[PDB]
Scaffold this active site. Structure first.
Site, PDB file in Angstrom:
ATOM      1  N   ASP A 182       0.715  -1.262  -0.017  1.00 47.95           N
ATOM      2  CA  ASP A 182       0.210   0.065  -0.420  1.00 47.95           C
ATOM      3  C   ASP A 182       1.316   1.227   0.183  1.00 47.95           C
ATOM      4  OD1 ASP A 182      -1.949   2.422   0.539  1.00 47.95           O
ATOM      5  OD2 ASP A 182      -3.170   0.654   1.708  1.00 47.95           O
ATOM      6  N   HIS A 183       0.592   1.452  -1.457  1.00 47.16           N
ATOM      7  CA  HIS A 183       2.207   3.117  -1.140  1.00 47.16           C
ATOM      8  C   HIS A 183       1.809   4.127  -0.702  1.00 47.16           C
ATOM      9  CE1 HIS A 183      -0.182   4.833  -4.793  1.00 47.16           C
ATOM     10  NE2 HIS A 183      -0.249   5.936  -3.982  1.00 47.16           N
ATOM     11  N   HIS A 213      -5.959   2.310   1.147  1.00 47.37           N
ATOM     12  CA  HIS A 213      -5.356   3.990   2.089  1.00 47.37           C
ATOM     13  C   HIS A 213      -6.139   4.430   2.849  1.00 47.37           C
ATOM     14  CE1 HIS A 213      -3.947   2.887  -2.332  1.00 47.37           C
ATOM     15  NE2 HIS A 213      -5.069   3.435  -2.616  1.00 47.37           N
TER      16      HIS A 213
END
Lengths: 485, 485
Positions: free
Chosen positions: B177-178, B240
């Site tokens: 999950d950047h 996110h």
């Protein structure tokens, strides 16, 4: 805006202070519409001048603040003058008449303010005569604005207060300290009481130390005759610094009324420790500026009119201790001096570092809340955050704010602020008797050691931030000055 | 710097993600000296390529990050390739050989990382074969990096987790999950735990509400085929947003070790309320973007490949409630959507206004701590101060901080950060099973109401900040969105 009905008598009416600051300030109040119809300004001095001549003096004084000529003239028409000798009781009858003539012509019921822009030696004399000669209004209020200084020791101050109380109550006395009338100094209580995260932390559990700095880059200059007998101790510490400290150390007031603000401040002032000779040597530092970096930066002893044998302090640094639960063990550091690294009046509140272990190479440092008062208003909050590194580590960042240009423009000059507050009867930004008496007792104890010479006199290179004994002072408790120049 | 001994196998080695982000990121680690001698990168895909051809692919990939040619070549020499079909068990024997050849040539004892940059349908298959075919190192660690997404519902996610646990332990699973690998998201815990004034206020007694916004100005674009089935709910909220919320709501950890950080986060995740149909209608909002301001801003239904009968959500806003003492009655507002007023990822923490009465016309408002994550990092603290007026009055001022240019330069890209953290075995910035399972249960409950269509579908003008039902949501508790566009 509501109309302020008042009659102001300026003793020392032809003086330089009156020309430069007093009149232009009363003019701004008129421009803002606070002073409209029912107000009169009676000027008084020894010089024999008539109404037209005095009106011209005022005209020349407000010239650089005039946009509309009709407005300027409408204002000046409210001025009258009466030559008067302050030492001659008989002479007060003449002033009494001019005052009553003014109150009639503009229909003013009492509401008198007496501004003493004269030599300190006349403060008590004038006040006593104001009562015995019947110059005090029998209706409305009677307020006195006493200029700097309010005494030169506790004894003299107590004698002045004693004379003043012949005709006035302490709540009618308005001692002038332009530092208390400064916009940023008035922001302290708003920042503290208006924000729960700061209000709750304003005590020994979060604060490690409070620092108050008042640095100047200039030297003694042409003012040698006066300064050599006062020093930073009486010129900057006793008056300005102590009162700024009052705002910082006060308890949380029951309300924001001047009465409660003063009660809150006094609870702190009454808990302040008065030092003995030993304590003065341990908690205070006195110094004199020496050789600077260039030929112009000459040592204090080589300044004109300065006695080659002067032991006067051009710098003071010290620790204050308050015997209140809120400040148990929290040192209040103050410092002020001539020929330092930068012109600046600021408050630095150092918060205790947290004990949370991130396992990093750099642990959490102390967060700092700084309130810059001079030369340009600012508020900075130094906090801990993550460093821009591969491994987790903390670092400090500065959240900052500065007064906008619009802010500077709308900020009333301190004299306008003080005059206006007096007309409103707002004692909030004025030191009361208890605060001033305690401030004197504290300084007398230090001054006693200095005149007796039972403490060393340090020295520091001009352009620095003071002698090393200043840093030694904080180091004893694991603290350090936040502002390094 | 210490040397990282590791062998990384990239499934999907000739892919676009590998070329653009994976290889350049592994290169930076080499440039920084973390990867020196004992490391090897084994690329794998179906395409029949030999070592020299693959080396050239990598060469072309790291070209725009090369200053020194000798360094680039020294790096590329560590790469090897082996064509391999993921569905063919027999084929894994060939990869097993290439891996062992690599570990020998560079003397690497286990320490294997397997990166699955393949289609989601192959995640479980590969993992199962990694164990049955003997590709897992018997010495050192074995870590898997699973790309987005980790399931499409709780059931699918639970099935994937079940397959993954055949060969790995949850602590060996690294879900990508950047957003969690972003520098500013990692600043939250430092700001909170590193500063006592914030740490002590991070609870129901000082915080009124927490707001999390993830706005985009773009529309569905060319990605219509995928988005129409996911929506903002699965594309931005589930992954996110929920993970960002985890950092904000977590309890204070016993230490800053990944294990304790996760325990602290899970205590919060486990207290989150799962909504029923009624609650979903009351606490959440779904919308779709309509007519914009110009011809280019066409409604969602008129976008290409978008089914004229689509009820997909391009916007989501909702309230989260945590059943923990620290958050009793503190609503957590989240919102994310397409075609909004500005590209921005931020956290706004609204503090309760103080009850101190200044007697002013404007009383103390709510202080706000904002942490801007995208597009440029920033931290702002809105506080109450005095207004620049004649009479005492409060007003709000913004203390601000922004990332310097040097900061941007030293900030590792999120993929470099994630690869590096995996090599270190640091699970701190990675969602664990408990966090992801709970995030799925929460969203499933909402998605259930949406697919069943037992909730309305709002609409909003493109370029706005969402439909009015979004503001209606906060207004019910006396709150309002801080960021207005």
């Amino acid at each position: 805006v509501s109309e302020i009905k008042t009659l102001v008598t300026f003793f020392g009416g032809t003086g330089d202070l009156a020309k430069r600051k007093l009149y232009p300030s009363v003019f701004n109040l008129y421009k803002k519409g606070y002073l409209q119809k029912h107000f009169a300004i009676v000027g008084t001095a020894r010089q024999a001048l008539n109404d037209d001549e005095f009106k011209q003096l005022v005209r020349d004084s407000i010239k650089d603040f005039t946009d509309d000529q009709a407005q300027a003239e409408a204002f000046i028409e409210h001025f009258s003058y009466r030559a008067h000798d302050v030492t001659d009781a008989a002479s007060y009858a003449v002033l009494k008449e001019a005052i009553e003539e003014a109150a009639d012509k503009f229909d003013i019921d009492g509401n008198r303010i007496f501004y003493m822009s004269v030599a300190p030696r006349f403060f008590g004399t004038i006040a006593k005569y104001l009562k015995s000669e019947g110059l005090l209004a029998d209706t409305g209020y009677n307020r006195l604005m006493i200029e700097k200084p309010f005494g030169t020791s506790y004894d003299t101050a107590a004698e002045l207060q004693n004379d003043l109380e012949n005709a006035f109550d302490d709540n009618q006395l308005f001692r002038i300290d332009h530092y208390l009338g400064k916009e940023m100094v008035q922001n302290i209580a708003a920042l503290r009481f208006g924000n729960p995260i700061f209000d709750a932390a304003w005590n020994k559990d979060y604060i490690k130390n409070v620092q108050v700095t008042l640095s100047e880059v200039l030297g003694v200059e042409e003012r040698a005759g006066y300064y050599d007998t006062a020093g930073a101790l009486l010129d900057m510490i006793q008056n300005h610094t102590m009162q700024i400290v009052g705002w910082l150390a006060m308890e949380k007031p029951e309300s924001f009324t001047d009465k409660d603000i003063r009660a809150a401040k006094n609870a702190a002032f009454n808990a302040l420790k008065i030092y003995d000779e030993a304590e003065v040597n341990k908690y205070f530092v006195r110094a004199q500026y020496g050789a600077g970096d260039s030929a112009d930066f000459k040592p204090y002893l080589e300044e004109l009119d300065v006695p080659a044998d002067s032991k006067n302090n051009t710098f003071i640094a010290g620790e204050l201790q308050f015997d209140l639960p809120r400040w148990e063990g929290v040192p209040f550091y103050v410092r002020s001096g001539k020929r330092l690294a930068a012109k600046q009046t600021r408050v630095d509140i150092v918060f205790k570092a947290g004990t949370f272990n991130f396992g990093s190479e750099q642990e959490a440092c102390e967060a700092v809340l700084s309130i810059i008062i001079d030369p340009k208003g600012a508020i900075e909050l130094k906090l801990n955050a993550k460093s821009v590194e591969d491994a987790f580590n903390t670092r400090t960042i500065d959240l900052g704010w500065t007064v906008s240009d619009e802010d500077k423009k709308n900020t009333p000059e301190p004299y306008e602020r003080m005059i206006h507050d007096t007309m409103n009867g707002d004692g909030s930004n004025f030191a009361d008797w208890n605060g001033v008496s305690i401030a004197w007792k504290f300084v007398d104890a230090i001054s006693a050691v200095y005149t007796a010479d039972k403490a060393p006199l340090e020295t520091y290179k001009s352009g620095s931030m003071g002698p090393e004994a200043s840093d030694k002072l904080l180091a004893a408790n694991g603290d350090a000055w936040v502002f390094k120049g």
